[PDB]
Design a protein around this ligand. Sequence first.
Ligand SMILES: NC(=O)c1ccc[n+]([C@@H]2O[C@H](COP(=O)([O-])OP(=O)(O)OC[C@H]3O[C@@H](n4cnc5c(N)ncnc54)[C@H](OP(=O)(O)O)[C@@H]3O)[C@@H](O)[C@H]2O)c1
Ligand SMILES: NC(=O)c1ccc[n+]([C@@H]2O[C@H](COP(=O)([O-])OP(=O)(O)OC[C@H]3O[C@@H](n4cnc5c(N)ncnc54)[C@H](OP(=O)(O)O)[C@@H]3O)[C@@H](O)[C@H]2O)c1
Ligand SMILES: NC(=O)c1ccc[n+]([C@@H]2O[C@H](COP(=O)([O-])OP(=O)(O)OC[C@H]3O[C@@H](n4cnc5c(N)ncnc54)[C@H](OP(=O)(O)O)[C@@H]3O)[C@@H](O)[C@H]2O)c1
Ligand SMILES: NC(=O)c1ccc[n+]([C@@H]2O[C@H](COP(=O)([O-])OP(=O)(O)OC[C@H]3O[C@@H](n4cnc5c(N)ncnc54)[C@H](OP(=O)(O)O)[C@@H]3O)[C@@H](O)[C@H]2O)c1
Lengths: 261, 261, 261, 261
Amino acid sequence: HHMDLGIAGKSALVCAASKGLGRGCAEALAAEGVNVTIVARTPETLDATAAAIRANAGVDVQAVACDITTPEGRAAALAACPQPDILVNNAGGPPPGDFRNFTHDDWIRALEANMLTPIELIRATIDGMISRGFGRVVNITSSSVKAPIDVLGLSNGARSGLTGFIAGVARKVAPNGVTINNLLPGIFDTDRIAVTFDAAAKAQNISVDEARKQRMATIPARRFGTPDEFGRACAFLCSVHAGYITGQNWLIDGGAYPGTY
Amino acid sequence: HHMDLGIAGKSALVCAASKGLGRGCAEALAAEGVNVTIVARTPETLDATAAAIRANAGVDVQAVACDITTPEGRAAALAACPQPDILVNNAGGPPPGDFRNFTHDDWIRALEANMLTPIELIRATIDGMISRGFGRVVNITSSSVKAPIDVLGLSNGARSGLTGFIAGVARKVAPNGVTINNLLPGIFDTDRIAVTFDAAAKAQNISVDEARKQRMATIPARRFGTPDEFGRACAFLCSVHAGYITGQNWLIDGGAYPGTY
Amino acid sequence: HHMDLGIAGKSALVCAASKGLGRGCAEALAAEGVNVTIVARTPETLDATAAAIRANAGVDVQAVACDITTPEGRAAALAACPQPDILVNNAGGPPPGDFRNFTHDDWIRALEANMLTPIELIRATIDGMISRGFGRVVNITSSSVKAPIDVLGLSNGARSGLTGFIAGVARKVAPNGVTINNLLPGIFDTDRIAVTFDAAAKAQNISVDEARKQRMATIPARRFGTPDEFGRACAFLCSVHAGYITGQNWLIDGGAYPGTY
Amino acid sequence: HHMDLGIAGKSALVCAASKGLGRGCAEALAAEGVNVTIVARTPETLDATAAAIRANAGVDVQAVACDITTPEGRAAALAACPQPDILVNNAGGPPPGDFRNFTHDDWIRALEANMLTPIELIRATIDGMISRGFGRVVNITSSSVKAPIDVLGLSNGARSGLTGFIAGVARKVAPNGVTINNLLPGIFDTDRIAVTFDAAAKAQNISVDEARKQRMATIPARRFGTPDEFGRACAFLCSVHAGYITGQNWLIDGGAYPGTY
Ligand SMILES: NC(=O)c1ccc[n+]([C@@H]2O[C@H](COP(=O)([O-])OP(=O)(O)OC[C@H]3O[C@@H](n4cnc5c(N)ncnc54)[C@H](OP(=O)(O)O)[C@@H]3O)[C@@H](O)[C@H]2O)c1
Ligand SMILES: NC(=O)c1ccc[n+]([C@@H]2O[C@H](COP(=O)([O-])OP(=O)(O)OC[C@H]3O[C@@H](n4cnc5c(N)ncnc54)[C@H](OP(=O)(O)O)[C@@H]3O)[C@@H](O)[C@H]2O)c1
Ligand SMILES: NC(=O)c1ccc[n+]([C@@H]2O[C@H](COP(=O)([O-])OP(=O)(O)OC[C@H]3O[C@@H](n4cnc5c(N)ncnc54)[C@H](OP(=O)(O)O)[C@@H]3O)[C@@H](O)[C@H]2O)c1
Ligand SMILES: NC(=O)c1ccc[n+]([C@@H]2O[C@H](COP(=O)([O-])OP(=O)(O)OC[C@H]3O[C@@H](n4cnc5c(N)ncnc54)[C@H](OP(=O)(O)O)[C@@H]3O)[C@@H](O)[C@H]2O)c1
């Protein structure tokens, strides 16, 4: 038994996807027959992930080595995948800090990476989607837009800016068979959080395993998220069964956010 | 290809499901190998839907003819399906009117059908789900909990009451592999909205098609929702790939609700 | 200086107001020249509060000793104050417990007290406000409608039901110079709370002062709310300066709720 | 009667305040005895409004002619008012347009004016507020953060970015007697909307008065907001009676936004 998402043979541009949540989305789309173009900066891991997906899924896989948060990187991605049916927006997130230490340049860099980059990729791909009467955009954001994360003010700001803009464009382009939705991760078991736990353990004189355990104990689901399950939610949003879902912020966080809505 | 939801052979109790959104949920779950018990008041339609799901899905189908908004009906449903892995809560919705004409009996009827009935079925099934380390509850509610519907004050109130309570229990039971989420329909093309469009077309002296087209033009997606796609979202929430999603209100409305969140 | 709220000589019906937040609202309204009818069950305390407001504010004060959560109590309150310009809805809160121990009648009782009671008082007073082109309704609810409180499922449900219904009525009656808003307290230093901390101190063999300080340490403002400041926010909503505020949920909680919105 | 806000003799920096909502905030604070420093680019209207507030309120009024969205302008404002107790953040909003015509520079300018400028003024004033154990920051934003405005994508984005960041800093600084809240205008009767209706009428073959009338008819309160009542709400947030309100988004829109929350 398995659910046909109806997107085999379509094309997807999956940003920041040699590892982690982006990789999970690329894998899940390829599993459903989507030809995927994956983007990341470092060739070694990018080429390896592209080869793995090729050998596991049997779809066409393209790899673009670029910084997606530059105009030149966006142009390189679109040169490889010029008319995507499906766009998964993603890029590395901003550094932590106390708000009094954020510089103007820190703000601009976070806004470029996690707000203006997704917006520009939508701008560059939306006309083709509209012309074909089908389109799916999924933006990987953060629980930070629902409840601010203490040390991640740059995310609290930049990703909330993206989300507020997305609300408008989602409803504007909805008449044309295009949906635009955001996937908001709680804590997911990737290399990104291992850096955070490594520093937290060393500061607290406990093991990383113990620090991870203590964090899990505060999550209602009592675990971290997996890149696999994140990618499956992405694939569902990109399917022919989610065409009546647009402008939505899907929080995938094990219940950690306490708000009713 | 096709995505394996991992719930073949599980049991679901699907309330108010001979027609409409409930039937869509039952069929989508049966398509993934779930043995479904479906509940409705009218035996003829209920038996015909049960027979159709048997013929199409090949799963075990039980049909319980009862009023799910009564304790005798809830007991009869649970007697047939006493340890469901999956509970889909649903019942008929309240009648329209101006708030100054709502009677006390009106309020109790709406609160019983669309708040206390789902709560009682959760109370009666949660301990078995917890003991097995797996459970899925999906409550069919309404866009009325995000933005009040003019003439449906009884829904605006009763379903918001359910949602506020669900927020707490979803997080309370999450440590045990149980998730509880709400699916909020916008306008879906069922028999319930045909009653509204027939009375509109006849009153205004226009065709039903014209009356429906006027409403569609106000929806960003420019169509109504289908019971099939509603059921597919339900099936995803009930899957092994949605275990990190709980306490969430999933609005499926073609972008009609204008709020950013 | 001092801000003239423009409501001197108007009439207010203030429910559940011999003590606590309700008394704070009655005193703040009376300080602005509003003639207040205050309602509580216990005559001794009610009369003492009524006499203190008379002495300090110099307005007309009526005391009605009744149970506002019954139809007979509402009839008595409205007989004494049949055409209020201002209605402050309030009642005792529901008891704590685990949802598996809520009886069906526990739910009915909480729904009657904290949802249907304020709805019926609005229905009985809204026509007069509309006919005069001025009206203010303020409903005392709870932070429980923004984030569920663990042991207060009955509040999480009933007050959320009220709130969803209020959303519709507020926008329905806004053309007639009537506003309807909700005031959502976080933890406020009333007798209800003082009893709770007496139990915590005794259970832990610590002083009441230490038990209270333990809770304050988790609140961003690092204190509890005062009934006075709650009443002042109520009075501002009831003023001629808040006529463009309706359907709003004002959370007054020292930042304790972590959600962005 | 009249309510004492307890802020006579305190100092406020009120940005973008020779006209409109900013002027309304400055006048309301001055009316409660606050010494106000008002900032605007054009000297003619700035000096006239400063003279009016001096004559009306008898407080100290400083006028700074500068563009508050530049570092040099922020520095000039702070030179005049180096240790404000109260900061009202405000600046001119972004131009309208279709999202496909927004340039990278359009985005940066909107982000600078309506997100990074308020953030930098908070960073420059928060230390002193904390050191005195009292502070009030009110950010004038927009209903666009609750529901996107069709042609104002630059606002939908930039002001949502501010709001997501403010959520974190409000809770961070709350232990020190500082509150940070946002005031979200719906449509207010200022010079800003005259330009909007001047274009809306010129294209619709109706008068600006007719276009205004038709827009009013869609607002539940059936009118536009006044700068006076907006300023009064600002003054209440800045008072000693609002110290338990922080991190809140106060929507002042006559009920036009349809969302329950
Ligand atoms: N993990 C969580 O708990 C969590 C939760 C919420 C939000 N997030 C956010 O979700 C996003 C993905 O996080 P993750 O945990 O999946 O991180 P991850 O495991 O480190 O994966 C990041 C991936 O993106 C690529 N990448 C990063 N910046 C890029 C850029 N500018 N251009 C192109 N490729 C880029 C990386 O490869 P290269 O380094 O070779 O480019 C890698 O393939 C981040 O924005 C993160 O802040 C994460
Ligand atoms: N359609 C929409 O646009 C929409 C949107 C939001 C919310 N909703 C809500 O979603 C729910 C389902 O609506 P729908 O459009 O699917 O309606 P529908 O097409 O009329 O189907 C309702 C189903 O529920 C059954 N049912 C009704 N009352 C029952 C009861 N007391 N006990 C057992 N079964 C009962 C009906 O069969 P019997 O009559 O034989 O019992 C039928 O099988 C309602 O609460 C509705 O208000 C609908
Ligand atoms: N304090 C908080 O932290 C907090 C926070 C959120 C919500 N709330 C809610 O706010 C409401 C007021 O709480 P509070 O802290 O102000 O309580 P409080 O200090 O105990 O005052 C309650 C007042 O209401 C009266 N009352 C209670 N039940 C009544 C009834 N059936 N009919 C008429 N009068 C009635 C009481 O007098 P009699 O006993 O003589 O009738 C008393 O005057 C409650 O619903 C509470 O749950 C409180
Ligand atoms: N009116 C509404 O319906 C409405 C609703 C929601 C949001 N808003 C937003 O609220 C803000 C205020 O709007 P409003 O209606 O009050 O406008 P307004 O009547 O045109 O007043 C704007 C004031 O700000 C000053 N100003 C503008 N940009 C400035 C800058 N960079 N530096 C310093 N002073 C500056 C202007 O004077 P100078 O030109 O001489 O500098 C003037 O004193 C805007 O961001 C607007 O988009 C307005």
